[PDB]
Design a binder for this molecule. Structure first.
Ligand SMILES: O=c1ccn([C@@H]2O[C@H](COP(=O)(O)OP(=O)(O)O)[C@@H](O)[C@H]2O)c(=O)[nH]1
Ligand SMILES: [Mn+2]
Length: 287
């Protein structure tokens, strides 16, 4: 029933890419009519989920700010469930949540290498989707914890499969994208191929689609391990390979995941989420 033109107007942002060759919209500030979407989704009584992992010192450094900002900006006006995965529940920041927000926490095993902590998320998310998320929400977003919501991140971002345009490479040509370029990896993307460079910090869609995204990415991760190779950008390299083969039905502009270190150019009209400065010396314990 819902048609693209009903809520999406690409002409509002003529200076940026607003539609892909496969007809998927690239959501930029100004192109969406949230009022129409809020009414539409409210009538369907949807619930939106959000998974976030915090293992090690990532808990103390980013979890509270992430959750506090999500409570205030994520899908306001609709029921939301935050799924928090931590290795130590006693360090879980229990903040006060607002109307239509609720959550639950799970204790997970901390992988020894941070690279595996990041990649294992694909396996864990899939397990949870099958165990409960598929029965609890209509859409699910999976996000990095090292970022903070800055403004409304609403229903205009929902879709079957949603990808995030990475802030540094959104205007670059495919041959400049940092895809895994070794043919020995399952994440390999040959020069001459590729649509965009997607950021692994944010991705989502229906539970069914996210299950496939995570399952396929994890299969590639395990395959590489058997071939004694590890993708340059780990799960992100695999995520980009997946989206090349199974194109996203919706893409979010860099306004939805911005790096202020770049500054604030003309294209970034209203930032909905920003990167946290990196602090690897503290939050990571290897390589
Ligand atoms: O020791 C670690 C390494 C990773 N992560 C989680 O995995 C995501 C991916 O890692 P990171 O943010 O370090 O990647 P970067 O964006 O800096 O490449 C993080 O946001 C966390 O949610 C974690 O909790 N602990
Ligand atoms: Mn991150």
């Amino acid at each position: 029933k819902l048609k693209l033109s009903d809520w999406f107007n690409p002409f509002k942002r003529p200076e940026v890419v607003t539609m892909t060759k496969w007809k998927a919209p690239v959501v930029w500030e100004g192109t969406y009519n949230r009022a129409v979407l809020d009414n539409y989704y409210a009538k369907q009584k949807i619930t939106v989920g959000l998974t976030v992992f915090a293992v090690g010192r990532y808990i103390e450094h980013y979890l509270e700010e992430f959750l506090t900002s999500a409570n205030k900006h994520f899908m306001v006006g609709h029921p939301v469930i935050f799924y928090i995965m931590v290795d130590d529940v006693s360090r879980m920041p229990l903040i006060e949540l607002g109307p239509l927000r609720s959550f639950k926490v799970f204790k997970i095993k901390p992988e020894k290498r941070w690279q595996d902590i990041s990649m294992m998320r694909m396996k864990t998310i899939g397990e949870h989707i099958v165990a409960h998320i598929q029965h609890e929400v209509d859409f699910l977003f999976c996000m990095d914890v090292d970022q903070v919501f800055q403004d409304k991140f609403g229903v205009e971002t929902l879709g079957e499969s949603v990808a995030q345009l990475q802030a540094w490479w959104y205007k670059a040509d495919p041959n400049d994208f940092t895809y895994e370029r070794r043919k020995e990896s399952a994440a390999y993307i040959p020069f001459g191929e590729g649509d965009f460079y997607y950021h692994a910090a944010i991705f989502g869609g229906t539970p069914t689609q996210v299950l496939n995204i995570t399952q396929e990415c994890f299969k590639g991760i395990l395959k590489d391990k058997k071939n004694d190779i590890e993708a340059q950008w780990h799960d992100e390299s695999h995520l980009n390979k997946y989206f090349l083969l199974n194109k996203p039905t919706k893409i979010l502009s860099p306004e939805y995941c911005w790096d202020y270190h770049i500054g604030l150019p003309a294209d970034i009209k209203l930032v909905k989420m920003s990167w946290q400065t990196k602090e690897y010396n503290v939050v990571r314990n290897n390589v």
